[PDB]
Amino acid sequence: SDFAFNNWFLLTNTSSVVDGVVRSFQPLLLNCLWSVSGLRFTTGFVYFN
Amino acid sequence: SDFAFNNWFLLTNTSSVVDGVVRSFQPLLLNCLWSVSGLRFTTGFVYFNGTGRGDCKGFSSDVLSDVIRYNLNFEENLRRGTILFKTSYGVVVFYCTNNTLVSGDANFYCFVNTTIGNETTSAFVGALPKTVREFVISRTGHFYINGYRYFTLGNVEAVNFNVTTAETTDFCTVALASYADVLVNVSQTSIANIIYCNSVINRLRCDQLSFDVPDGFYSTSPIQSVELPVSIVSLPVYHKHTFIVLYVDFKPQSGGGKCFNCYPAGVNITLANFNETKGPLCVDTSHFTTKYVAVYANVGRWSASINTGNCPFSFGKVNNFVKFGSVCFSLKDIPGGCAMPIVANWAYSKYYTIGSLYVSWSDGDGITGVPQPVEGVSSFMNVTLDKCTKYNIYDVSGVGVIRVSNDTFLNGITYTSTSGNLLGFKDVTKGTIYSITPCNPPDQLVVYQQAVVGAMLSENFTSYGFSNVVELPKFFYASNGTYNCTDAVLTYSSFGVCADGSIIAVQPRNVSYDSVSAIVTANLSIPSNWTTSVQVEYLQITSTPIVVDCSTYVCNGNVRCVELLKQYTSACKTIEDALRNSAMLESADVSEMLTFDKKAFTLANVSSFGDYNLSSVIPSLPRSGSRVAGRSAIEDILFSKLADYKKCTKGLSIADLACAQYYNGIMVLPGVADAERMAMYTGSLIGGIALGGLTSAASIPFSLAIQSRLNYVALQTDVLQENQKILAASFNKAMTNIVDAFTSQALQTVATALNKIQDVVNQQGNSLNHLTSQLRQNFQAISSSIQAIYDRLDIIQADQQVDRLITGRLAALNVFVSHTLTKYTEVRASRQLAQQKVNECVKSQSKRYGFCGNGTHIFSLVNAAPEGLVFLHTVLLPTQYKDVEAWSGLCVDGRNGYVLRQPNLALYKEGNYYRITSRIMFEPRIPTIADFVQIENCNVTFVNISRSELQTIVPEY
Amino acid sequence: VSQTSIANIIYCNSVINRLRCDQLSFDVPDGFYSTSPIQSVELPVSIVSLPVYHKHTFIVLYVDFKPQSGGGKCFNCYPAGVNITLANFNETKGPLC
Ligand SMILES: *[C@@H]1O[C@H](CO)[C@@H](O[C@@H]2O[C@H](CO)[C@@H](O[C@@H]3O[C@H](CO[C@H]4O[C@H](CO)[C@@H](O)[C@H](O)[C@@H]4O[C@H]4O[C@H](CO)[C@@H](O)[C@H](O)[C@@H]4O)[C@@H](O)[C@H](O[C@H]4O[C@H](CO)[C@@H](O)[C@H](O)[C@@H]4O[C@H]4O[C@H](CO)[C@@H](O)[C@H](O)[C@@H]4O)[C@@H]3O)[C@H](O)[C@H]2NC(C)=O)[C@H](O)[C@H]1NC(C)=O
Ligand SMILES: *[C@@H]1O[C@H](CO)[C@@H](O[C@@H]2O[C@H](CO)[C@@H](O[C@@H]3O[C@H](CO[C@H]4O[C@H](CO)[C@@H](O)[C@H](O)[C@@H]4O[C@H]4O[C@H](CO)[C@@H](O)[C@H](O)[C@@H]4O)[C@@H](O)[C@H](O[C@H]4O[C@H](CO)[C@@H](O)[C@H](O)[C@@H]4O[C@H]4O[C@H](CO)[C@@H](O)[C@H](O)[C@@H]4O)[C@@H]3O)[C@H](O)[C@H]2NC(C)=O)[C@H](O)[C@H]1NC(C)=O
Ligand SMILES: *[C@@H]1O[C@H](CO)[C@@H](O[C@@H]2O[C@H](CO)[C@@H](O[C@@H]3O[C@H](CO)[C@@H](O)[C@H](O)[C@@H]3O)[C@H](O)[C@H]2NC(C)=O)[C@H](O)[C@H]1NC(C)=O
Ligand SMILES: *[C@@H]1O[C@H](CO)[C@@H](O[C@@H]2O[C@H](CO)[C@@H](O[C@@H]3O[C@H](CO)[C@@H](O)[C@H](O)[C@@H]3O)[C@H](O)[C@H]2NC(C)=O)[C@H](O)[C@H]1NC(C)=O
Ligand SMILES: *[C@@H]1O[C@H](CO)[C@@H](O[C@@H]2O[C@H](CO)[C@@H](O[C@@H]3O[C@H](CO)[C@@H](O)[C@H](O)[C@@H]3O)[C@H](O)[C@H]2NC(C)=O)[C@H](O)[C@H]1NC(C)=O
Ligand SMILES: *[C@@H]1O[C@H](CO)[C@@H](O[C@@H]2O[C@H](CO)[C@@H](O)[C@H](O)[C@H]2NC(C)=O)[C@H](O)[C@H]1NC(C)=O
Ligand SMILES: *[C@@H]1O[C@H](CO)[C@@H](O)[C@H](O)[C@H]1NC(C)=O
Ligand SMILES: *[C@@H]1O[C@H](CO)[C@@H](O)[C@H](O)[C@H]1NC(C)=O
Ligand SMILES: *[C@@H]1O[C@H](CO)[C@@H](O)[C@H](O)[C@H]1NC(C)=O
Ligand SMILES: *[C@@H]1O[C@H](CO)[C@@H](O)[C@H](O)[C@H]1NC(C)=O
Ligand SMILES: *[C@@H]1O[C@H](CO)[C@@H](O)[C@H](O)[C@H]1NC(C)=O
Ligand SMILES: *[C@@H]1O[C@H](CO)[C@@H](O)[C@H](O)[C@H]1NC(C)=O
Ligand SMILES: *[C@@H]1O[C@H](CO)[C@@H](O)[C@H](O)[C@H]1NC(C)=O
Ligand SMILES: *[C@@H]1O[C@H](CO)[C@@H](O)[C@H](O)[C@H]1NC(C)=O
Ligand SMILES: *[C@@H]1O[C@H](CO)[C@@H](O)[C@H](O)[C@H]1NC(C)=O
Ligand SMILES: *[C@@H]1O[C@H](CO)[C@@H](O)[C@H](O)[C@H]1NC(C)=O
Ligand SMILES: *[C@@H]1O[C@H](CO)[C@@H](O)[C@H](O)[C@H]1NC(C)=O
Ligand SMILES: *[C@@H]1O[C@H](CO)[C@@H](O)[C@H](O)[C@H]1NC(C)=O
Ligand SMILES: *[C@@H]1O[C@H](CO)[C@@H](O)[C@H](O)[C@H]1NC(C)=O
Ligand SMILES: *[C@@H]1O[C@H](CO)[C@@H](O)[C@H](O)[C@H]1NC(C)=O
Ligand SMILES: *[C@@H]1O[C@H](CO)[C@@H](O)[C@H](O)[C@H]1NC(C)=O
Ligand SMILES: *[C@@H]1O[C@H](CO)[C@@H](O)[C@H](O)[C@H]1NC(C)=O
Ligand SMILES: *[C@@H]1O[C@H](CO)[C@@H](O)[C@H](O)[C@H]1NC(C)=O
Ligand SMILES: *[C@@H]1O[C@H](CO)[C@@H](O)[C@H](O)[C@H]1NC(C)=O
Ligand SMILES: *[C@@H]1O[C@H](CO)[C@@H](O)[C@H](O)[C@H]1NC(C)=O
Ligand SMILES: *[C@@H]1O[C@H](CO)[C@@H](O)[C@H](O)[C@H]1NC(C)=O
């Protein structure tokens, strides 16, 4: 809790709602905390693993 | 205006209405005034041109005439005539022979023969009219005699009228005309007058389906009706095209010599995309422009073209911003797919189709038809800014105007309202966003004395010819008159409008009232002689019960329908059971409320009253009939200002509207409040005023009675009673004033009651006026007529499409019953209140403030009215006040202080002597010792008097 | 969401959170609510029919697409796609019911 997540966005095929309360399905599993710290051009191939 | 137009008729394909008000499209353009004056047999050929040998009068544009109307003014005699119609395909003539022989004379036989090219054909007139008063024809070829249309010819290039009349006063008119939108008033199916829908005020009037709309507020939307610039916006992706083109090359050998619909040299029609394997060709690149392609060399009068099929999307419009998941267009048949037919016409007379374009499709967002043929690596995003336009933005279409805004809103790309209409969008390029305001928001306008005045708007502009647009909070307002604030002729809670349209802020009702008169041993004022007034109220008392027959209403007499319904008797029983039980309940109540007194009914004779002359209220005597009573004057005036089935199975008249309802199955029961016992009740109540408890049964003068009622408020103490004689002159005058008002706030009160009565009557009628209309529409069935449904189908698939009718009808019926119960359960409250106040005010003066009138109450009259009562609360209002100087108590020389036995009295020093008066009237009463009471502790604030001068005030000793 | 931008979220895991999310709000006022907790797994299947000694009919179809790979020229070209049929066809070929 208290995470700003300013960059983090919703996902919608249709027109986005504004300033509302909505329950929905989102891809929000923490999974790997970062997994990209110090990202460089040779990021390698990750395949849903 | 004022044109009789007795011959002139309506035009209707379907059954004609009778004696109604209807707005419709009619060919009523004056065009050439006459154009046929002095008509002779050589009338010539006129072809929808100004080439008419007549006085046009110069009001005729002479551009074109959609239709030709012939008006005949001849005696009712038969005169030889012929009709010639000229068309490019053929010439058709109409002839009739009076004599029996087919040739007859140049038993009546009429033959119309039509010849095309060198071929001559013979046609059969069949039915021949006894008399024809009007003739109608049109360019489309519709043929109308006396309004109805017998048949429609394919086309008419020109019309020639072969009518020969020896009479010099041959006929009245043969003219040309054009369509227009008008309104009409019809009596006995015959026109009376019309109203052109051109001006704004006339537009509103026609919209009202009436004339003379009452002064008030209405809403209107003025809309532009012209082409507007078109704007498009899509996501930029470098266009990769796909062209689907088809090469129909009908090229027959003319087809007019043997057959056009025989498909000669009709053969190959194909598009290059067919595969030797002939797998269905579905495009892959999203952007494709479908086009019809070139057409075969075209010869005169005939053509071929594509027709709309059964698919959702019409071919040719597909390119107009459509979506698809997989086109898969194929030339041969495709399993489970829609197909379209191409047909050819020979002068719009032969129709021959060809199996063409099997298409099946999946829905999707990848493929999209684009109108613009050019597709490539280019930059385009046309966007007109500040005008009304069409638009397509990211596959959403509409019309409106675009406004630049300043809002970051980088979360997404499209914003839509709760309704589903988009509000604004953001450009992909930069980040600016634009709103989409609608072109024509509704405007609120006002009308008064059958002309428009003033207007509530949204834009700071003078849309109409109004000369001023006063900005006001929450809205703008136009007006054409100066502001002088003289008065208001219309009003709403916030504000009222002037006669010329000037707006004014309302000042609430200046009034004044009274309150407790605290004893303070100081100057105070008591009310003097009053003046009379009358207030009117109205109470709803009853509702006209209605009953319904389930099986008639839905079955409508079909035995098979009745049998399919037979399994639903569990359902519809509840409806009629509820309606019937509620009706008998309420009728029992209203019959329990109405009492009667023969002792007092006789007293209603006007001779018993006196100067009051309440002639209107008293019931009328029987008109040489054995009827107990007759309605009073205010009664028939009210009814004036506002059938037997015995004649609905028998008789020679056409059925009336009410009669029709019985046939359908609704049935309005006779009203509970019948006039006989209603009038007896009202008369008995009125006679209960002049009757007082006496050993004998005789009456006493009405004057004494009022005095007694006054005593209730306080002990009237005067011997020469000026009030009895003064108030009557105001009373009878007020009554004459108010009956004139029927035929000063009291006036607005009467206006409110009248408005309420017409309100309840409209509210009652339009309920079943809404009910009986819903069976005319078929929810999902082929047609409403059950009998027709049985005719059109066999036993297995007829009942299946039948039952969905009754499945809807029962729902509508359950809605109706559930709203009738909600009318009864609420009117019961008004009944409670009415019975609660009639027995209170009508019988015994109330001491409750504000229940019987503005001020102190003396007596109240009652009369009947449609489904309700009306009261006449006579009251008293203070003309002037008399001031006086008082003392809050008394102190004897001894410690004891005296006070009064009840508060409503008050001492004062009238002169040398002291007089104690009532608090509510200026009547004075003598002092005495019995009117006081003792309390030890003396307050100095009271009169200070010793035992000596006590003997001077009260004779103690 | 404020100005189309996220502010905070609530995982719908606990029973109380489940009810709260169902309320389309936060902090539902103290009171009474109704809920249905439902099993979400496969359950044994039971059948019952009128006993009649079963006489069978087998309808079987033999689609044998077998194309020559299809990745070198075309897969949707129906190569060696041909015969797909079920033994029940009649020389008269009356519909088989
Ligand atoms: C924009 O529009 C696009 C349109 O495509 C939207 O994308 C679609 O979004 C829907 C909804 O999220 C999505 O359906 C879901 O798919 C995922 C993945 O499916 C595979 O995972 C399941 C396991 O969950 C595996 O069994 C299998 O690999 C699934 O694939 C199969 O899908 C069906 C159903 O499972 C199978 O029968 C097929 O054979 C196929 O192989 C699923 O996670 C999700 O599954 C949920 O519902 C199903 C059906 O009731 C259920 O069986 C699952 O168990 C699960 O239900 C609940 O179970 C989890 C257990 O952890 C529990 O935590 C939750 O309660 C779950 O709800 C469902 O099938 C669809 O695939 C997307 N489209 C495509 C083509 O990918 C996009 O979301 C839109 N974006 C917005 C919102 O704007
Ligand atoms: C009995 O039943 C018969 C059944 O056939 C009824 O006959 C039909 O009546 C309807 C309604 O009147 C009639 O539709 C009207 O046709 C006339 C003539 O059409 C031609 O004129 C227009 C110009 O107005 C030209 O553009 C062109 O020549 C028209 O022909 C074309 O029709 C459509 C639409 O225009 C075209 O797309 C086709 O390509 C075809 O060539 C029209 O005057 C009338 O047009 C009005 O509506 C259209 C469509 O919205 C609009 O585009 C027009 O501008 C016009 O709308 C308004 O514009 C005028 C401008 O002066 C304005 O003053 C009014 O507000 C207009 O309303 C419409 O198309 C139909 O053709 C008749 N049937 C046939 C086959 O002829 C008969 O009326 C019934 N009788 C009753 C009442 O019982
Ligand atoms: C709608 O059309 C009807 C039919 O013309 C109009 O009603 C007719 O109105 C006239 C007056 O406009 C009535 O005449 C008056 O009748 C009385 C009683 O007979 C007579 O004493 C008067 O001297 C005068 O003739 C006529 O009775 C009436 N007829 C019918 C059948 O209604 C109606 O006014 C029209 N309304 C509009 C808004 O155009
Ligand atoms: C009961 O209601 C009626 C009508 O609302 C009241 O009648 C009116 O009483 C007011 C006093 O509140 C009178 O006002 C004054 O009139 C004089 C003379 O014109 C004027 O000089 C004053 O400045 C003030 O306007 C008004 O004339 C009178 N109108 C009528 C038609 O009678 C009545 O007073 C109400 N009674 C109570 C107890 O509220
Ligand atoms: C739903 O999301 C909105 C957006 O964040 C929440 O509203 C925001 O709530 C904060 C406090 O949680 C408000 O801040 C307070 O505002 C006042 C007045 O400016 C200020 O004096 C306080 O110090 C504090 O900053 C903020 O105004 C408000 N903004 C908006 C646009 O609503 C809302 O509370 C969230 N609700 C839930 C249940 O998560
Ligand atoms: C509203 O005001 C306008 C002008 O302020 C009035 O207009 C005149 O109307 C006649 C009749 O159409 C025209 O011949 C004049 O040219 C108009 N004058 C102007 C300056 O436009 C109009 O009559 C007024 N209408 C009402 C109902 O008040
Ligand atoms: C990423 O692309 C760059 C050129 O844009 C290239 O030099 C580099 O090798 C690429 N990275 C990998 C891991 O191949
Ligand atoms: C991911 O892990 C699974 C399980 O070991 C494995 O099958 C798969 O090959 C891994 N991913 C890749 C890209 O190899
Ligand atoms: C009209 O018909 C009559 C015969 O009925 C014919 O004598 C006359 O010539 C016709 N009129 C014209 C203009 O041809
Ligand atoms: C009617 O006038 C138009 C315009 O001049 C013309 O094209 C047409 O030919 C005229 N009518 C006839 C029957 O010639
Ligand atoms: C009917 O048609 C026949 C054959 O074309 C023709 O001889 C006859 O005059 C027609 N009848 C008329 C024009 O009344
Ligand atoms: C109707 O016909 C008569 C016949 O003499 C004529 O006098 C009168 O003017 C005509 N009325 C019209 C055409 O309105
Ligand atoms: C189609 O038919 C026409 C005439 O039968 C012929 O000219 C044309 O070559 C045919 N084929 C195509 C592809 O148009
Ligand atoms: C779109 O904009 C271009 C540039 O002015 C113009 O040539 C073209 O006609 C416009 N298209 C439409 C449909 O107005
Ligand atoms: C920007 O937008 C805000 C609110 O949408 C508005 O108050 C302001 O006037 C706009 N213009 C500027 C220059 O801030
Ligand atoms: C409204 O119109 C009047 C007309 O002169 C003008 O003076 C005023 O500035 C306008 N106000 C607005 C907000 O447009
Ligand atoms: C009407 O206006 C005139 C001129 O402005 C003024 O003299 C007069 O007092 C006004 N009268 C009313 C009743 O508003
Ligand atoms: C009604 O009330 C207003 C409110 O200020 C007052 O100015 C005015 O004297 C009153 N007018 C009448 C006719 O009572
Ligand atoms: C009011 O009371 C005072 C006593 O202080 C008295 O002098 C005066 O005359 C009284 N006013 C009237 C009008 O009698
Ligand atoms: C009240 O009484 C006085 C004196 O008797 C009289 O002059 C006045 O006209 C009366 N007013 C009314 C309304 O009766
Ligand atoms: C009213 O009473 C008088 C005598 O008291 C009598 O002549 C008259 O008939 C009565 N009126 C009625 C309607 O009975
Ligand atoms: C008084 O009574 C007579 C009797 O009919 C009636 O004509 C007259 O109109 C009445 N006057 C008033 C003011 O009620
Ligand atoms: C004719 O019809 C009218 C009304 O429809 C009716 O009153 C009358 O009795 C009928 N019979 C005769 C002979 O008038
Ligand atoms: C009693 O007299 C006193 C004298 O100061 C006064 O203030 C008070 O109001 C009086 N109380 C009464 C009359 O009840
Ligand atoms: C009346 O009141 C005066 C004023 O206080 C007081 O001096 C006097 O004693 C009183 N007289 C009585 C109570 O008799
Ligand atoms: C169907 O087709 C396949 C391959 O074309 C073949 O092996 C088989 O014999 C054919 N007939 C039947 C009945 O399967």
From Swiss-Prot, chain C:
Result for mutant: residue 57 to M: In strain: Isolate P100E
Subcellular localization(s) per the UniProt record: Virion membrane; Host endoplasmic reticulum-Golgi intermediate compartment membrane
Impact after mutating residue 27 to Y: In strain: Isolate P100E
Subunit structure: Homotrimer. During virus morphogenesis, found in a complex with M and HE proteins. Interacts with host ANPEP.
Domain notes: The KxHxx motif seems to function as an ER retrieval signal.
Function: S1 region attaches the virion to the cell membrane by interacting with host ANPEP/aminopeptidase N, initiating the infection. Binding to the receptor probably induces conformational changes in the S glycoprotein unmasking the fusion peptide of S2 region and activating membranes fusion. S2 region belongs to the class I viral fusion protein. Under the current model, the protein has at least 3 conformational states: pre-fusion native state, pre-hairpin intermediate state, and post-fusion hairpin state.
UniProt record similarity statement: Belongs to the alphacoronaviruses spike protein family.
Record's protein name: Spike glycoprotein
Gene that encodes the chain: S
Shown residues in whole-protein numbering: 244 to 340 of 1173
